[PDB]
Design an enzyme around this catalytic site. Structure first.
Site, PDB file in Angstrom:
ATOM      1  N   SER A  53     -56.582  39.501  -3.097  1.00 42.08           N
ATOM      2  CA  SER A  53     -56.513  38.289  -2.293  1.00 42.08           C
ATOM      3  C   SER A  53     -55.155  38.126  -1.622  1.00 42.08           C
ATOM      4  CB  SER A  53     -56.804  37.068  -3.167  1.00 42.08           C
ATOM      5  OG  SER A  53     -57.963  37.278  -3.953  1.00 42.08           O
ATOM      6  N   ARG A  75     -47.510  41.762   2.842  1.00 44.28           N
ATOM      7  CA  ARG A  75     -46.571  40.791   2.302  1.00 44.28           C
ATOM      8  C   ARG A  75     -47.287  39.926   1.278  1.00 44.28           C
ATOM      9  NH1 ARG A  75     -48.058  36.134   5.665  1.00 44.28           N
ATOM     10  NH2 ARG A  75     -48.721  36.935   7.704  1.00 44.28           N
ATOM     11  N   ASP A  79     -60.763  38.574  -0.675  1.00 44.33           N
ATOM     12  CA  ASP A  79     -61.717  37.625  -1.242  1.00 44.33           C
ATOM     13  C   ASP A  79     -62.566  36.955  -0.170  1.00 44.33           C
ATOM     14  OD1 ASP A  79     -59.071  36.857  -0.762  1.00 44.33           O
ATOM     15  OD2 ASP A  79     -59.407  34.860  -1.619  1.00 44.33           O
TER      16      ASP A  79
END
Ligand SMILES: OC[C@H]1O[C@@H](O)[C@H](O)[C@@H](O)[C@@H]1O
Ligand SMILES: OC[C@H]1O[C@@H](O)[C@H](O)[C@@H](O)[C@@H]1O
Lengths: 480, 480
Positions: A151, A166, A205
């Protein structure tokens, strides 16, 4: 009823109002940011402040008839880590066994140096603990295929590879940037004997949520509402959709023609809409949002749309408002512990205030504030605190509708047939459990350019199926 | 291509249009008919053409915590008869075992004289057949309590008693009028050894649907959406709601004071809204509506709103349109069997046409018309037939929203706490399975006086649970 404090609170509530004009501005601007985000960027993907618009290399929506042996799936969210086994039985049915473990505070702190191996070793350990409990017989011999749901923004290079662009939310593990997360996870599985577990798929997700609904949605229910978006409104926020291959300019033109030659027409896109308008060209901004972005967040300058919507930050907005009111000598913090305690007030705390009643002297608000930081309050004070919470949540819900409306407009999804409606798969604590959040989302969609006639054709459906079913579906398709 | 025929179809479709003004007129008129229907009726109830507004003697909405031993329930609908056993486990959970059997066509014919005993004897036999399969051990000894769902107008005298006012739909058994249906059913049950089966409750399928949703709705889901209406959109149409005891002036004044003293505030009302505006003071009427009402229906002069909405009649409307077009030498019926074959075209036939696609040359429409009456058609003809169907269904859906909006307005159901919404429990083949019917219903609610902001506070939820759970709840409460 202190007039000075009451007038100051009413003034703050007005700053969180999102008008129909703003929604139309943000909606249209969002579409612009999508079209630019789909162009080939030549700059450090980890520093690009635009809408990421990441191709996921997913081009086929499940039919609902997929079937196979038991698959594995691992889901590292923003707050918890889940391992599960998914058995796709076909005909929109599946059997799932899962174990949810919270992410240790060690990984969200920077006092002690953390490394990628610390994280993936732990994930490998939880995987072993899962297989030992639910599959004690065939833990070491079976050829497990695992779908990894990550996620966080990943520079996807294929269905089974991609490097972390990131961290977001509460993660700040530095050495994970620029590394393929699938390899890092597979190495730690091999190092504890689970080399027979092959991580063969990597998904967000959001992507998993969309694929999950395309499978679990009944044949009749799907003929009515076709899933066109998979989005998340929990600890963080994000969404995905199907984009025409021709419009995805980041993709290698040769690879594009190959997919087209194979009969493919679209590829799912991880919009990363939490980073919508990072430069704050149009997003509403308060004195409190600036502190959250620049002082209290792990990713200053990034994910500013998320920091106004997602449940990780909404509670922190209320804290900064109370501190501002105290700095103005308008609100007495008493013996509380709000000072120097970021995130002590959580969005869960606000959920007890959203629909608290004056008939009970706003006691739910009382216990919620005492339990969170020992903040003693009077009735008149709680009356005003409830106004602030309802202002914070309403702005979050209204902004949450902007990316959904933009995607539906850009893709012309709401008018494609007679009696045509679309389904938006929603997952997350806020959209699912925050009172009225979904209701207010529909209100903003009715004010957006699609109008109430568009809102009535959109079904914000709680997708409790999960990204595990979606990750398992990607594993079933991939080779061991 | 025949321009003459195309122009003739466009003119007919315009006759089925319901404007926003019409919806506002019918809504306000409906409330007026409600206010009059709650007054002491001055004429023979079997001939009263006004809105029945029948008290059901149900004053308590289930809490969801009811629990007890296994109950029995029998539901005589418009097309099928179902027997089931319901075990209320409490906490909004229940176990159900049911057997659905179609009502033999023998009972819908008048060539041979039919009597009540023939019907209830058959119903009693199915009850024995049910107990033999699901409770083969304790069929004769157990003391069964049965809740009887009678989906027809009944001059309710108590929770367990009531006289048939008049048949509707296909039933035309003359000797059943003016008789207590509970006793007729109990006598035929005793005559086959099921004397241990006691019919202790009598409810309408609207009341049963509403009570069922009050029980099955979770504490959280119900705190959000409070069920305020239970309505049916299947073979027939009807709805119920909770009315304040003070406003029910037809009810015995002494009985009201007793109920009020007991803490009761409302009593559910069986509006019987299929008989809304039987005199056609404002309901849309075509030359085809007149034929169905006066020639092809079993109850001329009654249930005219239903003859424009429910699925028993929608198919017959299309038949009368095609027969009229042939009389005008505009449409060739070929060797079909539409003439002198009432109800040969069913609403199920129309469901295959509502969302049929021209990309497939309207093949579903082709097969559906041949199966119904061997009516061969060309592509251009199917294109025109589909236009007619979409006009008929839209009128039914728009009219279907009027009674719901009127009830919500009269009862001030939308004036609730923050984030509070209302639920309308919907059951029936049309609302559940006819494509787009509910979607168009929500549109008419947005055009009604409650506006789009009201439609978004109203949840038309398909309650497939059934009146069995509702009937069982009335049986659990009653004494054996
Ligand atoms: O968890 C919700 C979302 O949070 C964001 O910070 C991540 O970048 C997304 O990948 C994720 O879907
Ligand atoms: O079955 C749906 C409805 O059909 C109508 O014909 C009856 O009058 C109602 O009592 C019934 O609820």
């Amino acid at each position: 009823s202190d007039p000075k404090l009451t007038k100051a609170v009413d003034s703050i509530c007005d700053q969180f109002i999102v008008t129909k004009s703003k929604i139309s501005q943000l909606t249209e601007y969002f579409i612009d940011c999508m079209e630019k985000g789909l162009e080939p960027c030549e700059s450090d993907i980890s520093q690009n402040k635009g809408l990421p618009m990441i191709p996921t290399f997913v081009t086929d929506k499940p039919s609902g008839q997929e079937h196979g042996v038991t698959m594995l799936a691992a889901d590292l969210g923003g707050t918890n880590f889940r391992v599960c086994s998914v058995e796709l039985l076909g005909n929109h049915e599946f059997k799932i066994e899962q174990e949810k473990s919270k992410i240790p505070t060690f990984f969200f702190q920077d006092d002690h140096h953390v490394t990628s191996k610390d994280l993936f070793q732990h994930m490998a350990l939880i995987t072993h603990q899962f297989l030992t409990k639910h599959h004690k017989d065939v833990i070491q011999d079976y050829k497990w295929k695992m779908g990894f749901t990550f996620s966080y923004p990943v520079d996807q290079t294929s269905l089974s590879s991609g490097k972390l662009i990131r961290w977001t939310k509460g993660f700040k593990i530095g050495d994970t940037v620029g590394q393929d997360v699938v390899q890092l996870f597979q190495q730690e599985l091999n190092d504890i004997g689970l080399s027979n577990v092959h991580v063969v798929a990597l998904t967000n997700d959001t992507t998993g949520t969309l694929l999950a609904r395309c499978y679990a949605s009944s044949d009749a229910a799907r003929a009515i509402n076709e899933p066109v978006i998979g989005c998340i409104f929990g600890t963080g926020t994000n969404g995905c959709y199907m984009e025409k291959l021709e419009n995805i300019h980041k993709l290698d033109p040769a690879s594009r023609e190959e997919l087209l030659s194979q009969g493919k027409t679209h590829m799912c896109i991880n919009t990363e809409w939490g980073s919508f308008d990072n430069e704050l060209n149009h997003l509403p901004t308060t004195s409190y949002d600036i502190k959250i972005d620049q002082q209290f967040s792990t990713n200053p300058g990034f994910h500013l749309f998320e920091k106004r919507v997602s449940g990780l930050y909404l509670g922190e907005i209320l804290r900064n408002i109370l501190l501002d009111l105290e700095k103005q000598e308008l609100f007495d913090l008493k013996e509380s512990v709000l000072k120097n305690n970021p995130f002590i007030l959580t969005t869960e705390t606000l959920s007890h205030i959203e629909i608290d009643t004056v008939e009970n002297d706003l006691q739910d608000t009382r216990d919620a504030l005492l339990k969170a930081a020992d903040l003693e309050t009077t009735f008149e004070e709680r009356v005003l605190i409830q106004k602030l919470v309802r202002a914070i949540s309403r702005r979050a819900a209204f902004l949450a509708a902007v990316p959904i409306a933009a995607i539906l407009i850009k893709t012309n999804a709401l008018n494609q047939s007679y009696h045509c409606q679309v389904e938006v798969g929603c997952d997350g604590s806020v959209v699912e459990h925050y009172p009225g959040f979904r209701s207010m989302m529909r209100h903003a969609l009715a004010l957006s350019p699609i109008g109430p006639e568009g809102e009535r054709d959109v079904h914000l459906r709680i997708s409790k199926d999960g990204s595990g079913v979606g990750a398992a579906l990607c594993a079933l398709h991939a080779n061991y």
